[PDB]
């Protein structure tokens with residue numbers, strides 16, 4: 001089905017993992033001398049800033065695929081102590097971010113490191129052949 | 130040769146498939162209190178909107194390569210009923226879009242589905258190893 | 259360590275090749291009727307133009323990985339006549355660009371050609387299977 | 388043999404659309420300014436080496452009469468005219484009762500006093516003591532009201548502001564450009580009436596230098612046609628539709644203002660200062676415009692030979708002058724050295740052509756208070772300051788704006804008279820060979836190629 | 841918390857007398873001086 005934009009906002013993370021191509025679709029874009037022109041323009045640039053803020057992180061991380069992705073960073077237990085079948089079938093994305101909001105910035109540091117490290121490491125395999 | 134920007138606009142789709150890196154090059158970018166400043170600015174942002182409109186579709190589809198690409202969607206005959214050597218050697222891109230303008234939006238739905246479906250499917254292969 | 263933004267600006271190219279994920283991080287983003295609003299806005303759009311100018315070249319070249327990359331273009335000796343262990347351990351990036359500023363545009367032509375050529379060539383391998 | 392869709396990014400695919408175009412002018416235009424350029428303040432320097440790509444095998448259909456780059460240009464020119472006179476000195480404490488007389492001259496009785504030596508009061512720097520000062524005005528600027536006492540013609544229509552003397556009204560070349568994702572297609576056909584397919588089309592980023600020349604009856608310093616003279620019309624049969632003529636060879640014209648005027652610098656306020664017309668140094672002479680009658684001879688012959696291609700071959704073509712109305716329509720309204728001329732074109736369009744060394748001088752009047760383009764609202768009126776010295780200017784006549792009479796089934800001949808009023812035509816005479824297109828580079832095509840899993 | 845990164849081994853050549861952030865600052869201050877007095881009371885009916 002197509003529940004639409006943000007359809008699975010109250011659904012389990014496993015059920016909302018099906019609707020990631022819909023929320024990404026409507027995330028960018030669906031006049032004389034006045035005050036509404038700027039009213040729309042500064043919003044129309046904030047849209048772009050809010051999009052590329054995410055995209056540059058998605059790029060400097062290992063995954064420019066822009067949908068879903070796995071990474072070579074061990075899930076540090078200290079972050080949640082919850083179970084695979086107890087979050088993907090018993091918790092909502094908002095609730096989840098509510099738990100992990102504290103450590104989000106930390107994780108971003110580790111992803112940037114792991115990715116730069118992987119790319120530097122792969123150049124050495126490409127250079128010997 | 131380098132026929133330049135839009136050189137192969139009257140050429141067959143097979144002959145214009147050689148000049149895709151040229152039209153993509155010149156597709157982004159080649160003052161006091163006035164009215165020309167905004168005149169240029171709103172155009173200079175429409176450039177970016179018109180570029181990223183295409184790029185987000187190219188990303189949510191299977192191909193962020195940004196040049197040419199194949200997809201796992203069967204070409205539904207009902208769309209054209211024309212032949213491989215009768216379009217790539219006997220039809221111009223404009224004429225072609227003139228035929229397929231009706232179904233373009235439909236195809237985009239199918240590409241988004243196929244891609245989200247492929248990525249979800251590949252995570253399951255990556256998780257068992 | 260994290261020497262910070264532009265930490266390795268006076269360091270050898272080999273030592274600065276470790277800090278490429280830091281300079282890329284701080285390269286995008288770290289009000290009533292007035293004159294500062296536009297003062298910030300035209301700068302806030304020049305940021306985006308200066309970013310995507312680089313990104314479109316990085317895309318039309320073979321490497322959208324956005325970190326480091328190798329290419330199938332032979333290093334034409336006529337450009338430098340210097341040695342691998344005499345630039346990566348005895349020269350700074352600025353000095354290096356100071357040498358190669360003359361030929362930079364030439365190299366960009368060759369990269370665009372090689373990439374369009376590779377992609378056209380790979381479609382023929384994908385079509386026979 | 389089972390086909391697969393394949394995405395393509397960068398396909399020559401465009402569609403007709405309308406965007407916000409910007410200006411572009413040479414680096415010299417930015418050079419010649421004492422705040423003197425009326426536009427170039429914030430214009431983009433033009434590319435030193437413009438590039439024009441010829442698109443082979445392409446046939447695109449143009450339509451000059453419903454083209455939007457014209458509307459953008461005109462409304463932009465209107466807004467620029469407006470904005471250039473906002474911060475300039477306003478002549479509100481004018482319109483005082485003017486005690487006027489003839490100018491000092493003894494000529495026969497068949498000479499109506501074009502100029503009037505007027506006297507009036509004025510407010511000085513202080514808002515107490517007045518100022519019995521005199522000026523010289525043209526008769527068109529003033530109107531009697533019931534010793535002859537007058538007023539300014541516009542006191543009863545709109546407010547008034549003076550055009551600063553620092554700014555100039557010199558038409559400079561404007562190249563219009565389109566943003567990324569768009570392009571401007573330029574028909575490269577020698578004989579093209581602006582509507583229909585163009586066999587040899589090319590593309591460009593910025594058009595050629597289009598000078599914004601404001602005239603009404605005759606197009607000036609325009610682009611010459613190629614080979615045979617060009618006729619363009621939206622509907623030739625409809626006598627209500629103008630007929631724009633573009634010339635192949637330019638007709639030399641010479642307009643002069645033989646009056647060495649004087650600039651009086653009155654102080655109306657603590658900041659403002661008004662520029663009246665002082666006494667005339669020399670003879671009381673009239674502004675006039677010259678047209679070499681030989682070149683005009685051959686030009687009229689070459690246009691009638693093109694007319695016969697549309698109105699039957701063995702017919703008689705007559706030329707008469709304007710019918711009447713405003714001065715802006717019945718005279719070749721234009722600006723030269725800053726003064727706004729209004730010339731009588733009755734000596735150019737009084738001819739008759741059957742199936743088969745001097746100058747024609749034209750009496751040119753001058754007006755200083757003009758209110759074209761409605762006045763930016765319902766208020767502003769502009770006073771063209773007086774210009775010292777004799778003004779002489781040489782221009783090209785490069786086109787005409789004609790109109791035909793509605794005889795219906797009257798004769799084998801039909802008479803043609805100058806027209807205008809709507810100045811968008813002045814731009815359609817140069818934006819007949821251009822059109823805008825947006826780029827949509829996403830195109831999918833079938834091929835027996837699938838990406839593996 | 842402003843951050844100042846010391847760039848070791850770097851030697852850059854400055855020129856204070858042909859520096860443009862100065863021109864921007866002054867012309868901006870001029871324009872601000874200007875704009876702050878536009879909507880303020882004008883004393884035209886003074887000078888008596």
Ligand SMILES: *[C@@H]1O[C@H](CO)[C@@H](O[C@@H]2O[C@H](CO)[C@@H](O[C@@H]3O[C@H](CO[C@H]4O[C@H](CO)[C@@H](O)[C@H](O)[C@@H]4O)[C@@H](O)[C@H](O[C@H]4O[C@H](CO)[C@@H](O)[C@H](O)[C@@H]4O[C@H]4O[C@H](CO)[C@@H](O)[C@H](O)[C@@H]4O)[C@@H]3O)[C@H](O)[C@H]2NC(C)=O)[C@H](O)[C@H]1NC(C)=O
Nearest residue numbers: 423555557558600607608722723724775779780781782783
């Ligand atoms: C169709 O095309 C024709 C051909 O181009 C065009 O003719 C142009 O006519 C105008 C109007 O007369 C000419 O412009 C004036 O030229 C005179 C003198 O000519 C040159 O003299 C010196 C060298 O001898 C040159 O360096 C100079 O630049 C001139 O080109 C000038 O006196 C005029 O300049 C004054 O006015 C300018 C703006 O109006 C100011 O920017 C300039 O600083 C001058 O200001 C002075 O003027 C006041 C007196 O007038 C004086 O009191 C002030 O203190 C101040 O010092 C002006 O440039 C032009 O040369 C002709 N064309 C060309 C190519 O030169 C037609 O006009 C055109 N059709 C239409 C409708 O315009």
Ligand SMILES: *[C@@H]1O[C@H](CO)[C@@H](O[C@@H]2O[C@H](CO)[C@@H](O[C@@H]3O[C@H](CO[C@H]4O[C@H](CO)[C@@H](O)[C@H](O)[C@@H]4O)[C@@H](O)[C@H](O[C@H]4O[C@H](CO)[C@@H](O)[C@H](O)[C@@H]4O)[C@@H]3O)[C@H](O)[C@H]2NC(C)=O)[C@H](O)[C@H]1NC(C)=O
Nearest residue numbers: 488489490491492503504505506520521522523665666667
């Ligand atoms: C448009 O209309 C205006 C109306 O004001 C005319 O302006 C006046 O014109 C008259 C002449 O037409 C000018 O009068 C002349 O003034 C000269 C200056 O002398 C006076 O000034 C000095 C100080 O500078 C005093 O000390 C002295 O006592 C004088 O009072 C005189 O020298 C002139 O004399 C000559 O003409 C008169 C005319 O009757 C003769 O009797 C004399 O013998 C002699 O031949 C003359 O009186 C007056 O100055 C003008 N106004 C101003 C403000 O200057 C414009 O001339 C008119 N323009 C046109 C084109 O018609």
Ligand SMILES: *[C@@H]1O[C@H](CO)[C@@H](O[C@@H]2O[C@H](CO)[C@@H](O[C@@H]3O[C@H](CO)[C@@H](O)[C@H](O[C@H]4O[C@H](CO)[C@@H](O)[C@H](O)[C@@H]4O)[C@@H]3O)[C@H](O)[C@H]2NC(C)=O)[C@H](O)[C@H]1NC(C)=O
Nearest residue numbers: 489490491492493494495496497498499500669670671672
């Ligand atoms: C001041 O203004 C007055 C006008 O009020 C002006 O006086 C006029 O001079 C002309 C001279 O050209 C007079 O015209 C003459 O009229 C008679 C008939 O009345 C004609 O026969 C004359 O013929 C001559 O001109 C013909 C063509 O021009 C020639 O073919 C012929 O052979 C003659 O040469 C002549 O035209 C006019 O009558 C007077 N006006 C009055 C009211 O007397 C005077 O010249 C001006 N002076 C200055 C200094 O400005």
Ligand SMILES: *[C@@H]1O[C@H](CO)[C@@H](O[C@@H]2O[C@H](CO)[C@@H](O[C@@H]3O[C@H](CO)[C@@H](O)[C@H](O)[C@@H]3O)[C@H](O)[C@H]2NC(C)=O)[C@H](O)[C@H]1NC(C)=O
Nearest residue numbers: 207208209210223224225226227228229230231232233234
């Ligand atoms: C895209 O789809 C539309 C339908 O949604 C297609 O429009 C249809 O086109 C046919 C012609 O191919 C039209 O038939 C016309 O009938 C009139 C009636 O007499 C006749 O005068 C015409 O000569 C023509 O035969 C049909 O009416 C029209 N559909 C509708 C609803 O108007 C369109 O052709 C498709 N585009 C392409 C490129 O195939």
Ligand SMILES: *[C@@H]1O[C@H](CO)[C@@H](O[C@@H]2O[C@H](CO)[C@@H](O[C@@H]3O[C@H](CO)[C@@H](O)[C@H](O)[C@@H]3O)[C@H](O)[C@H]2NC(C)=O)[C@H](O)[C@H]1NC(C)=O
Nearest residue numbers: 336337338339352353354355356357358359360361362363
């Ligand atoms: C980039 O390419 C340009 C050429 O397009 C190089 O410029 C050239 O540099 C040499 C020096 O290496 C110049 O020689 C000079 O000759 C004068 C004449 O006496 C002398 O006084 C100087 O000491 C110097 O020897 C040469 O003139 C100059 N070319 C031109 C056309 O001016 C430039 O060096 C290249 N950049 C790099 C980093 O190599």
Ligand SMILES: *[C@@H]1O[C@H](CO)[C@@H](O[C@@H]2O[C@H](CO)[C@@H](O[C@@H]3O[C@H](CO)[C@@H](O)[C@H](O)[C@@H]3O)[C@H](O)[C@H]2NC(C)=O)[C@H](O)[C@H]1NC(C)=O
Nearest residue numbers: 598607608609610611635636637638639781782783784785
């Ligand atoms: C009045 O019209 C004449 C037309 O002959 C103008 O002189 C001519 O100006 C045109 C350009 O406006 C010149 O054509 C150009 O010549 C160059 C030469 O290299 C050519 O490469 C260009 O493609 C273009 O065709 C033309 O040569 C010139 N005629 C002569 C005899 O020099 C004159 O400037 C006009 N005056 C105005 C508009 O005030």
Ligand SMILES: *[C@@H]1O[C@H](CO)[C@@H](O[C@@H]2O[C@H](CO)[C@@H](O)[C@H](O)[C@H]2NC(C)=O)[C@H](O)[C@H]1NC(C)=O
Nearest residue numbers: 483484485486506507508509515516517518519
């Ligand atoms: C404005 O100019 C007129 C004449 O053009 C002056 O009119 C005078 O008005 C007074 C009114 O009391 C009469 O008594 C005079 O007879 C008028 N004529 C004169 C004085 O020549 C008027 O005074 C002028 N305004 C001023 C000087 O402020």
Ligand SMILES: *[C@@H]1O[C@H](CO)[C@@H](O[C@@H]2O[C@H](CO)[C@@H](O)[C@H](O)[C@H]2NC(C)=O)[C@H](O)[C@H]1NC(C)=O
Nearest residue numbers: 529530531532538539540541542543544545713
């Ligand atoms: C504004 O002034 C103009 C000219 O003084 C007026 O136009 C003239 O009006 C009178 C009387 O209404 C007519 O006799 C004239 O024929 C008109 N002139 C022309 C050229 O048509 C105009 O009516 C005035 N507007 C007002 C007073 O509202």
Ligand SMILES: *[C@@H]1O[C@H](CO)[C@@H](O[C@@H]2O[C@H](CO)[C@@H](O)[C@H](O)[C@H]2NC(C)=O)[C@H](O)[C@H]1NC(C)=O
Nearest residue numbers: 451452579580581582583618619620621622623
């Ligand atoms: C430009 O010239 C062409 C050719 O003369 C005109 O094409 C005519 O178009 C009408 C209807 O659009 C047809 O009925 C005629 O048969 C066409 N002429 C020919 C010779 O086939 C076109 O109308 C002209 N356009 C303008 C604006 O003058």
Ligand SMILES: *[C@@H]1O[C@H](CO)[C@@H](O[C@@H]2O[C@H](CO)[C@@H](O)[C@H](O)[C@H]2NC(C)=O)[C@H](O)[C@H]1NC(C)=O
Nearest residue numbers: 646647648649650666667668669775776777778
């Ligand atoms: C028009 O009148 C002006 C009046 O100022 C003349 O300018 C003066 O001309 C004389 C002789 O030509 C010079 O001696 C003066 O120096 C000039 N005045 C100034 C302020 O410089 C001007 O010459 C007249 N027009 C012509 C074509 O001569």
Ligand SMILES: *[C@@H]1O[C@H](CO)[C@@H](O[C@@H]2O[C@H](CO)[C@@H](O)[C@H](O)[C@H]2NC(C)=O)[C@H](O)[C@H]1NC(C)=O
Nearest residue numbers: 639640641676677678679680745746747780781
């Ligand atoms: C228009 O003006 C131009 C220049 O003022 C005239 O051209 C010159 O005119 C002078 C005097 O008439 C001659 O001595 C020159 O030989 C002319 N040169 C050229 C290149 O023509 C032109 O003749 C005038 N034409 C008209 C119709 O007034």
Ligand SMILES: *[C@@H]1O[C@H](CO)[C@@H](O[C@@H]2O[C@H](CO)[C@@H](O)[C@H](O)[C@H]2NC(C)=O)[C@H](O)[C@H]1NC(C)=O
Nearest residue numbers: 707708709710711712716717718731732733737
């Ligand atoms: C066009 O020419 C005609 C005929 O020469 C002019 O008609 C004359 O106009 C004047 C001014 O109104 C009248 O006094 C005459 O009675 C008119 N003559 C006729 C026979 O009607 C007409 O003025 C000219 N057009 C222009 C705009 O000047």
Ligand SMILES: *[C@@H]1O[C@H](CO)[C@@H](O[C@@H]2O[C@H](CO)[C@@H](O)[C@H](O)[C@H]2NC(C)=O)[C@H](O)[C@H]1NC(C)=O
Nearest residue numbers: 497708711714717718730731732733734750752
């Ligand atoms: C434009 O030219 C025509 C034609 O010369 C002028 O009409 C003349 O008007 C005067 C009256 O001032 C008559 O004496 C002439 O006999 C008229 N000419 C003809 C041929 O009849 C007209 O006045 C001029 N100006 C305008 C504004 O129309």
Ligand SMILES: *[C@@H]1O[C@H](CO)[C@@H](O[C@@H]2O[C@H](CO)[C@@H](O)[C@H](O)[C@H]2NC(C)=O)[C@H](O)[C@H]1NC(C)=O
Nearest residue numbers: 705706707708732733734735736737738739747
């Ligand atoms: C067209 O212009 C010619 C040229 O002036 C006019 O011819 C004049 O006709 C009158 C008749 O009343 C003669 O008295 C003049 O001598 C003629 N002038 C010349 C120079 O020959 C002609 O009148 C104009 N057209 C019309 C319809 O009047």
Ligand SMILES: *[C@@H]1O[C@H](CO)[C@@H](O)[C@H](O)[C@H]1NC(C)=O
Nearest residue numbers: 075076077078079103106110
């Ligand atoms: C991750 O968990 C380990 C347990 O070995 C703990 O020592 C460490 O501090 C945690 N890391 C971070 C960055 O919180």
Ligand SMILES: *[C@@H]1O[C@H](CO)[C@@H](O)[C@H](O)[C@H]1NC(C)=O
Nearest residue numbers: 204205206207208232235239
């Ligand atoms: C594709 O073609 C099939 C033929 O089996 C047809 O049934 C179907 O409606 C077409 N699909 C679409 C979405 O047009």
